[PDB]
Amino acid sequence: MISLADLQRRIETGELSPNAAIAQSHAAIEAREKEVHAFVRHDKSARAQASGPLRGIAVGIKDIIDTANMPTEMGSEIYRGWQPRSDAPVVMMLKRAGATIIGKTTTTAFASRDPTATLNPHNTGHSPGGSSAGSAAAVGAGMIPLALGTQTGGSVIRPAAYCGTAAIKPSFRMLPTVGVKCYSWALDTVGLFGARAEDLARGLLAMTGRSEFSGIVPAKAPRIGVVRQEFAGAVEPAAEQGLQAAIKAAERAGASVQAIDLPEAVHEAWRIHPIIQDFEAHRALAWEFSEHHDEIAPMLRASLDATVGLTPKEYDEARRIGRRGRRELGEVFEGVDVLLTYSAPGTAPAKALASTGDPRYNRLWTLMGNPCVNVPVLKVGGLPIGVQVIARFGNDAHALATAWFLEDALAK
Amino acid sequence: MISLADLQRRIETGELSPNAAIAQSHAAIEAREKEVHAFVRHDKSARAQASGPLRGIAVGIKDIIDTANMPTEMGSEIYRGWQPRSDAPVVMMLKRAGATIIGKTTTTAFASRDPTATLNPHNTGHSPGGSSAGSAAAVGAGMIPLALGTQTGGSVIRPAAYCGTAAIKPSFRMLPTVGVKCYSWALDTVGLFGARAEDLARGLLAMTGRSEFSGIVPAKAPRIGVVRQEFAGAVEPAAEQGLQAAIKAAERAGASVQAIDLPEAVHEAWRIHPIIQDFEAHRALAWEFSEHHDEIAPMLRASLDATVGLTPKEYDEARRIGRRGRRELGEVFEGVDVLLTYSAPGTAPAKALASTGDPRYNRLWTLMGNPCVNVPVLKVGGLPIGVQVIARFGNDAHALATAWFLEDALAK
Numbered sequence: 001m002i003s004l005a006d007l008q009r010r011i012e013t014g015e016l017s018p019n020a021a022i023a024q025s026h027a028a029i030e031a032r033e034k035e036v037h038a039f040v041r042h043d044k045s046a047r048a049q050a051s052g053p054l055r056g057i058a059v060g061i062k063d064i065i066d067t068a069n070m071p072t073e074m075g076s077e078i079y080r081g082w083q084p085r086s087d088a089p090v091v092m093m094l095k096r097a098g099a100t101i102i103g104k105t106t107t108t109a110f111a112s113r114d115p116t117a118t119l120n121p122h123n124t125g126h127s128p129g130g131s132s133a134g135s136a137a138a139v140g141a142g143m144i145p146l147a148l149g150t151q152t153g154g155s156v157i158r159p160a161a162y163c164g165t166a167a168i169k170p171s172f173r174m175l176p177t178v179g180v181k182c183y184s185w186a187l188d189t190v191g192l193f194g195a196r197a198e199d200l201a202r203g204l205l206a207m208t209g210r211s212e213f214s215g216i217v218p219a220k221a222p223r224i225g226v227v228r229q230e231f232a233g234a235v236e237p238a239a240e241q242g243l244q245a246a247i248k249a250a251e252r253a254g255a256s257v258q259a260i261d262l263p264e265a266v267h268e269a270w271r272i273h274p275i276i277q278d279f280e281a282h283r284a285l286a287w288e289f290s291e292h293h294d295e296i297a298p299m300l301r302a303s304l305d306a307t308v309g310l311t312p313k314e315y316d317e318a319r320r321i322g323r324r325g326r327r328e329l330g331e332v333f334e335g336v337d338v339l340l341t342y343s344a345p346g347t348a349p350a351k352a353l354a355s356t357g358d359p360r361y362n363r364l365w366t367l368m369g370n371p372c373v374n375v376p377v378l379k380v381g382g383l384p385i386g387v388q389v390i391a392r393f394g395n396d397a398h399a400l401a402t403a404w405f406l407e408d409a410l411a412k
Numbered sequence: 413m414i415s416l417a418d419l420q421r422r423i424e425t426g427e428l429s430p431n432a433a434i435a436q437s438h439a440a441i442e443a444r445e446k447e448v449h450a451f452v453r454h455d456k457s458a459r460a461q462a463s464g465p466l467r468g469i470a471v472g473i474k475d476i477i478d479t480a481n482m483p484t485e486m487g488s489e490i491y492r493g494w495q496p497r498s499d500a501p502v503v504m505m506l507k508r509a510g511a512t513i514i515g516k517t518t519t520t521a522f523a524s525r526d527p528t529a530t531l532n533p534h535n536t537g538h539s540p541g542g543s544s545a546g547s548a549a550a551v552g553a554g555m556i557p558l559a560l561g562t563q564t565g566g567s568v569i570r571p572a573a574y575c576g577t578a579a580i581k582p583s584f585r586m587l588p589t590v591g592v593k594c595y596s597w598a599l600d601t602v603g604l605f606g607a608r609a610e611d612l613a614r615g616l617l618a619m620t621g622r623s624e625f626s627g628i629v630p631a632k633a634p635r636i637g638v639v640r641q642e643f644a645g646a647v648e649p650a651a652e653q654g655l656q657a658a659i660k661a662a663e664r665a666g667a668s669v670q671a672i673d674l675p676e677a678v679h680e681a682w683r684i685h686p687i688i689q690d691f692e693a694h695r696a697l698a699w700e701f702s703e704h705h706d707e708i709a710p711m712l713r714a715s716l717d718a719t720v721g722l723t724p725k726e727y728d729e730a731r732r733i734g735r736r737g738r739r740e741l742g743e744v745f746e747g748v749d750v751l752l753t754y755s756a757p758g759t760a761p762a763k764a765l766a767s768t769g770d771p772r773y774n775r776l777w778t779l780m781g782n783p784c785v786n787v788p789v790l791k792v793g794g795l796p797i798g799v800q801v802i803a804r805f806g807n808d809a810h811a812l813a814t815a816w817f818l819e820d821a822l823a824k
Contacts, residue, residue: 068699085494092698176597178696182590210724284590286504287480312622 018056052098088179105134129159130356154362164384172369236346269325430468464510500591517546541571542768566774568603573755576796584781648758654797681737
């Protein structure tokens, strides 16, 4: 994988040149696209910019995020050829910092369950996950140093884990969703994929100019609370293997690790996530569902068909539960600095299964809103396995710091 | 003005057919549109639907709200001829309910300060307000029974007051802002324009399907708390005359009224509203500001050019202040059912002033998120004056009921 921070340093000292950096990505992409299929379209003519901390940095953008110079097809035939007039605010944050929008990465139709044609970089016979399939795969294939994705359920953390890349879903609403196809406005959150926690930090800094992302350093003696989300069902061995590997490394590194169960109110929040997501999806995709029903990809069309009867009443109650869940979650952070849990059910599923994977271990946090970071840990049978690092709402910086601490810990 | 509730009742009993109802609107639009100029576009072929609670009901749509079959030009040359792919969810809520989208109504460029060419229905020498100029003007001129607008500061309540129409800015995020050109995602709220409070209720009931909007009836001996928002400065005579008149009509109607001071924390919220708004505006209109700076309407261009320096730090500080204001504000509602205040600084300004009016008496409530309803009280010099009925967050039904009560109180 390509490191964003690495490129920056090398370019900042004049050791490396922006055009060279960009030329590399163009090469890297051409080197494996026929193998990975992580891009809907690649702008071969894309060139580096003259100034800014991100000059020389190639960025892939999930195709539900508006671009003014390239189509934004939503991973759906309904939007084949569709061309937004403007660039989404998050895209502008990148361009204003000097980034090079190198192409649009694949997304499942309307960022839901329907698999894309993208293949896992580590094993072409497996899925790269969803819905931010291309952003994770392209970064995992060393095609680009950065990529934007989105998460409603687990569309950022899970695919990152599956593809062995670092990634973060910032605190809810920190990054605007303007110009980003909505699935569920109560959940949709923009995310970044990179090589390491550090790369993610430098990215958010460039995009937001927020001091908290400036000079982030690995955390020291982190207070960690491990939650296995029993309420989310049974996990796969490989996943537990990764979590234990991470806990062991962290303890050796000086972290105080303690297992903990989540409040009952949090369990409930995890359970009603689908209610909020699907009820809102019906409003958010009302036009598509009403005028182009049969054109909506199979799986999404099915989940929508099955939920046409969700009511405003049960939806309001679902949101009440969500609020209760957040409140009692904050209390959990009185004792620990971060929570550690699985990033996915296990290794990425074979493409033959026609599944991007179950987001059951990701959804809760998207609803709570806390910042989440995927930390690549190990690989079972060649397929990557990671762990999810979660901090208090609004403390994305500490999440990346601890995620960084953890990365070095695993590096022995 | 055309009453939505009235048309519904007559269509229901069979007294009026949906086709005839829509024909009535096309005609009502034809009759005054040349003198008012409330529509960017009037779809003369728009027909009524056969079923639904809103069959035979024509609705004007503020032009920053996406429509699939008509252009959405955002009141700006930058988006001339811009055609959205999908209808915004709120639009779909109307269509799915059986309504007819009869046209797009004027909006100031990107919903800010730059006046539209629309004229006040009560006196063409005056402003209809803004930024939802056309929606207030069209309903006020008796062209349509309903219209959608938005409010970041006072874009719904103020123009409604100026044009003498009933209107509601529902609780924050109750209506989705998907497909609605964003100015400030922390503030942007969709609102409705109608003849009376009851027409609003019927509109929200059909759009949301929420029971709290079903069977609404005038409130009885409501407990009212009068707030003059001194932090905003003194209001113009006409505005006070209208307020003083509403209090007396209410008291004589059986309601208990009392002057109340707003928590200092709330005053501060009003004060920092501009920071949140302007700071976000810079991210929301990033593409426009960077790629088409000089094409931005003069006034908005000036306010943006003057706030480029706002920082993430002061921004977050303002959001913290806003949240504190929300908490302490809820307290106020433990003693009183609704608050009663001004809708605008006074009567509509003369067009020659090149101003859509000062939003200072509207902005706080948009940040607080409480549902607000404008009640037309009287007219000075032939120009309408209203008062703003405000209920605690999520208590929209009570806001409409009290507004309905007040409407009757004034009819004596």
